[PDB]
């Protein structure tokens, strides 16, 4: 019963001083909340090009955030309802996406500095939960893992090294040997995660000093019971999952290091697997004739996220792009992926 | 350049490997001593793909022989061609696995495996540019299945960018040789799903059918059956060993035949296949070969291609042939049998041609098909597993080797998912 719901939003970073100094032109314009236009900077020297006007490349979103949008604005207008879904006993999932160097980590997760929407996600989670806790005891557990070359690192507790995925009785997915910290405040989980970021595999690549080589996956479980512990309870374990997708890579022209080529390929493969999983879930949600298996099997990322992705859950794709023509190609591909993540012709 | 590493695990696997080696040595003009006594310079040009050159003008298979029992090793060493193998490349245990995947994967096999790993690392170091690995084994027993799988996992961890090929002899439906075969197959198939890039599904029942119906052979022995498998194996890698007009190696084949990561289970085939009597009343021509190869009754997997669709098919031709004729024949087969080919992958056929034919024949062909009918093989196995597992039959033995029920649950789930995926893409 796939009733998959995914909102797709995107954050346009403000043009940086470096981009301005390098002569960057504004390829990105927002026409509406629903749409973004990427002005492909063609010379248009031919009559055909002048007639076709391929410059106006449109992409479909639920909410395009402009250059002035902050972490608080992205939170307030996108993930806010996903947090509510978890509070109410459903799962939800947030995916950060874009070419490496796009600022995905800072917009969404942070790293001590730049709290990201993750801080905002937890901040409202805990205020609402602490209030609800008066009647229904809550245990907000938190795990943080790394999906790298299809192996899973325990980021909160690296002594478990690289782990597999297993099916639960009633076939949900568990990562073996993962540390789960029961918390009461955003300060605890946020610091826990940011500390966990220290154990992530990252490298100083040409496109990004801190390029993630892996998908950073947060799993916050809002476990609840009526405080009447001696009674039979239909408890809930809603999972608020946030994924820092590994940045897309086409930097292999210079990243000729054996491991970077391996990592690059596995990253791109699994980003595409996510894409295919999303396309399948959307098609089933739409109720198209494509009755078949959702290919969660194609990656560890999707196998694990299956538990939220195939049900009555709220998900969100948050992409990161630049207005500069100097990175037109990266913005183009980032927008293309996101457009395909949504698959709705409203634009 | 482009060296392949060969691994043989468990009795059946070893036996098949022996046959494979025998054929290939003959092909490259290598005698039982390791000396080249061939005529053609083409036989030695790419000798390094399968052989290391030892001191004093001798050649030695880049082969590792693995078993939990020593008897098999002895049998191999005493065989015709037994002396060609490097003595240090025999890695054997003393206990055996007793048809228990857990013994092979977790216990005895675990103890064994480090030696094997050490050997294969050395073998990798020796070779200038190893393209990848070929493992010959079965899924139904303990060693080839459990130990083999373990070995594969280890290999992939150290060589994640290299090509991983398995020739897996699968349990047939009717001819069930053992009682726990369903368990062993299920457990091993799961592991194969994640760690092999291409898996050649070979089935004993189908082989028997070929031997009885097509070769009209009075008494098939395992050796005869093995020969067929060996031929098929030789076919795939002919492009690495000889020149040609259109050349396709292990990687090229995989990329053309595997559209989705998990769907890498092939039904292989070989042609021509005739009796002694029916040799005279036949045309040695490409149309006939083509006709033979695409027939359902010429498949070495016990699956009806007419019960599914071909996702992709690779044909590898050996001998002096006109490209146009080859192309015509392949187009004709897809046009005439439209209903057996998925319609959303135009030109479902990949062709490769090597100028050097196998010995005794002027023309030969090898077929590799990715057919949605392979689901039948998985489905039956799944069913049998369910039948056992529902009553927890024979579970205790496995659990005594450290295995947990949950693994079984996982594997079964995985296989089911795989089956579903095949069905949907049909
Ligand atoms: N096609 C062939 N199949 C074989 C051959 N020998 C055995 N088999 C098949 O394989 C299965 C028996 O497998 P094995 O003897 O290889 C089990 P192995 O020695 O690997 O582990 P143990 O459980 O430790 O014996 C069964 O289905 C046989 O019918 C052979 O030469 N050719
Ligand atoms: N006209 C002509 N076409 C050929 C010949 N050999 C191959 N082809 C065509 O070339 C295409 C296949 O490309 P190849 O040149 O074999 O491949 P390649 O350039 O070696 O690339 P890779 O092998 O993939 O690295 C097909 O369209 C063949 O029909 C030839 O001798 N003459
Ligand atoms: Mg044996
Ligand atoms: Mg070529």
Residue numbers in the entry:
A (entry chain K): 1 to 347
B (entry chain H): 1 to 44, 47 to 360, 369 to 436
What did the authors write?
To understand the molecular basis of kinesin-8B’s essential role, we characterised the in vitro properties of kinesin-8B motor domains from P. berghei and P. falciparum. Both motors drive ATP-dependent microtubule gliding, but also catalyse ATP-dependent microtubule depolymerisation. All the reconstructions show that Pbkinesin-8B-MD and Pfkinesin-8B-MD contact a single tubulin dimer in the MT lattice, with motor binding centred on the intradimer tubulin dimer interface. The interaction between Plasmodium kinesin-8Bs and α- and β-tubulin is centred on helix-α4.
In the NN structure of Pbkinesin-8B-MD, density corresponding to nucleotide is indeed absent from the nucleotide binding site (NBS). The conserved nucleotide binding loops—P-loop, loop 9 (containing the switch I motif) and loop 11 (containing the switch II motif)—adopt a canonical conformation previously described for the NN state of a number of other plus-end directed kinesins, including human KIF18A. Density corresponding to loop 9 is visible between the P-loop and loop 11 but is poorly defined. Adjustment of the reconstruction density threshold reveals some evidence of connectivity between loop 9 and both the P-loop and the helical turn of loop 11, supporting the idea that loop 9 is partially flexible in the absence of bound nucleotide. Consistent with this conformation of the NBS, on the opposite side of the kinesin motor domain, helix-α6 abuts the C-terminal end of helix-α4 and density corresponding to the beginning of the C-terminal neck linker peptide of Pbkinesin-8B-MD is visible protruding towards the MT minus end and adjacent to the β1-lobe. In both Plasmodium kinesin-8Bs NN reconstructions, there is an additional connection between α-tubulin and loop 2, which protrudes from the β1-lobe of the motor domain and appears to adopt a partially helical configuration.
